[PDB]
């Protein structure tokens, strides 16, 4: 009951259960179907602590549907599910039975999308989408401001649909080049003026802590299941199950490729697309086994439409290796013997499927 849940919180039982669920999440790192090289293993436990931090903002600090606020569910030091390094992610908990206004300045970032989601990794292992809005339907006011309404009730203007079970808004700002693009500056509020928040309720905290702990276990399990499923096509980059990518919170404009890779120090993975389709954005990123992008603050581990130089015939080649071969487009393996990799077409009517092959890195340096 609710009485027991509140009693367990006040007594410290919930805190014990919270920490023990965190502890049990270590088994997702120790799984025998995951690589056990020291780097991957060490990064896996850091990954768990990173999921923790995200989980607590998600389910404890920014979980009041009467008082929504944005936080970042993936960024430079906390990462989930092939986090797009070219994205500013913003997430707010909402209540699908209420109505919300998202306001602020549009900025100059060219790609901007708004998804409402329900469930959650901690609940159903999913982030099923309930509504969506991007530039195709967005109306920008003359003054450069943004006015967006989230509601289960149809509204005029920039309306993003919710269902009663909707519980999150996930914003993607996708940068061609963060140095020259300005992010949209968005705030979220409840439409009807809210009285000051009530004091922290033991029952609500009991639920937030357990959801946070279960988020760590389920999210790590979810994407570890994905990474292990890629082993049969290691070092290739086949198209992903698109409906599955959407069901875990993907953006419906995006066509995904996910795989795992494995390279010795003297090997390189050569990725080729013969043509580049008409699209709004594309990129490819290198990840560790836990599907965290590698550390793009310090390594070149993502190449996109803005930074990838095409070949003479219009194709694009991208090389995964320990050092750059000549002036080719390059993904730095950054000390990793193995990891995962993600390619995105955004807004492509006809995706073009990359081919891959493994060669000796010396063969590319001599030839280039």
Which residues contact a second copy by CB under 8 A? 5-6, 9-10, 12, 14-16, 19-20, 22-23, 26-27, 29-30, 36, 38-39, 41-43, 45-46, 48-50, 52-53, 56-57, 60-62, 67, 77, 196-202, 205, 209, 212, 295, 298-299, 334-336
Positive/negative CA dihedral, 237, 243, 246, 252:
positive
Binder of residue 234, out of Na ion, a second copy, none (CB less than 5 to 8 A by kind): none
Q: Of 283, 341, 325, whose CA–CA distance to 307 is shortest?
A: 283
Binding Na ion by CB under 5 A: which of 48, 51, 82, 210?
Answer: 82
> Cα 248 to chain center, whole Å?
10
Name which of 43 and 134 has its Cβ closer to a second copy.
Answer: 43
Angstrom distances, CA of residue 6 to CA of 2, 11, 162, 178: 6, 9, 30, 46
Judged by CB under 5 A, the chain residues 212 through 241 that form the site for Na ion are none
The tally of CA atoms less than 13 A away on the side-chain side of residue 193 is 0
Name which of 209 and 361 has its Cβ closer to a second copy.
Answer: 209
Name which of 44 and 250 has its Cβ closer to a second copy.
Answer: 44
Binder of residue 81, out of Na ion, a second copy, none (CB less than 5 to 8 A by kind): Na ion
Positive/negative CA dihedral, 212, 216, 217, 218:
positive
CB contact set of 232 (below 8 Å; sequence gap of 6+): none
8 Å CB contact between 105 and 184:
yes
Q: How many residues bind Na ion (CB under 5 A)?
A: 3
Smallest gap from residue 254 Cβ to Na ion (A): 9
Taking CB atoms, the residue at the shortest distance from Na ion is: 82
Q: Cβ atoms within 10 A of the Cβ of 2, count?
A: 10
Q: Rounded distance, CA 20 to CA 6, Å? A: 18
Q: Rounded distance, CA 186 to CA 90, Å? A: 9
Tell me the backbone φ, ψ of residue 292, rounded to 5 degrees. -90, 135
Name which of 77 and 350 has its Cβ closer to a second copy.
Answer: 77
Smallest gap from residue 7 Cβ to a second copy (A): 10
Binder of residue 82, out of Na ion, a second copy, none (CB less than 5 to 8 A by kind): Na ion
81 binds Na ion (CB under 5 A): yes
Smallest gap from residue 248 Cβ to Na ion (A): 8
Binder of residue 264, out of a second copy, Na ion, none (CB less than 5 to 8 A by kind): none
DSSP string covering 183-229, please?
A: --EEEEEESSPPPPPPPPPHHHHHHHHHHHHHHHHHHHHHHHHHHHH
Name which of 162 and 227 has its Cβ closer to a second copy.
Answer: 227
346 binds Na ion (CB under 5 A): no
* Residues contributing to the site for Na ion (CB under 5 A): 81-82, 88
């Amino acid at each position: 009951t609710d009485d027991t849940r509140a009693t367990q919180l006040l007594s410290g039982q919930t805190w014990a259960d919270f920490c023990d669920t965190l502890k049990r999440s270590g088994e997702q790192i120790l799984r025998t179907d995951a690589p056990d090289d020291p780097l991957t293993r060490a990064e896996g436990f850091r990954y768990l602590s990173r999921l923790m931090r995200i989980a607590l903002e998600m389910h404890v600090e920014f979980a009041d549907g009467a008082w929504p606020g944005f936080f970042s569910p993936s960024h430079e030091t906390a990462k989930i599910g092939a986090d797009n390094p070219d994205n500013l992610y913003q997430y707010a908990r909402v209540d699908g039975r209420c109505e919300y206004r998202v306001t602020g300045r549009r900025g100059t970032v060219a790609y901007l999308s708004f998804g409402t989601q329900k469930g959650g990794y901690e609940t159903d292992g999913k982030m099923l989408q309930t509504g969506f809005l991007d530039a195709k339907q967005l109306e920008i006011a003359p003054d450069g401001s943004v006015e967006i309404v989230l509601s289960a009730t149809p509204r005029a203007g920039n309306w993003v649909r919710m269902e009663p079970d909707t519980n999150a808004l996930l914003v993607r700002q996708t940068f061609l080049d963060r140095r020259t693009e300005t992010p949209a500056q968005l705030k979220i509020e409840r439409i009807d003026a809210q009285a000051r928040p009530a004091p922290l309720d033991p029952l609500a905290l009991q639920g937030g802590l357990m959801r946070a702990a279960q988020f760590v276990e389920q999210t790590s399990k979810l994407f570890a299941d994905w990474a292990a499923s890629y082993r049969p096509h290691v070092n290739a980059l086949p198209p992903a199950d698109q409906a599955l990518c959407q069901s875990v919170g993907g953006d419906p404009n995006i066509y995904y490729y996910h795989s795992c890779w494995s390279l010795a120090a003297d090997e390189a993975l050569v990725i080729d697309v013969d043509t580049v389709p008409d699209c709004d954005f594309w990129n490819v990123q290198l990840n560790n086994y836990w599907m965290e992008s590698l550390d793009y603050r310090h390594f070149d581990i993502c190449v996109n439409k803005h930074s990838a130089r095409p070949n003479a015939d219009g194709g694009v080649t991208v090389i995964v290796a320990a050092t750059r071969p000549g002036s080719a487009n390059w993904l730095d393996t950054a000390g990793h013997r193995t990891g995962t990799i993600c390619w995105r077409w955004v807004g492509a009517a006809q995706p073009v499927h990359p081919r891959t092959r493994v060669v000796k890195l010396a063969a590319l340096k001599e030839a280039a």
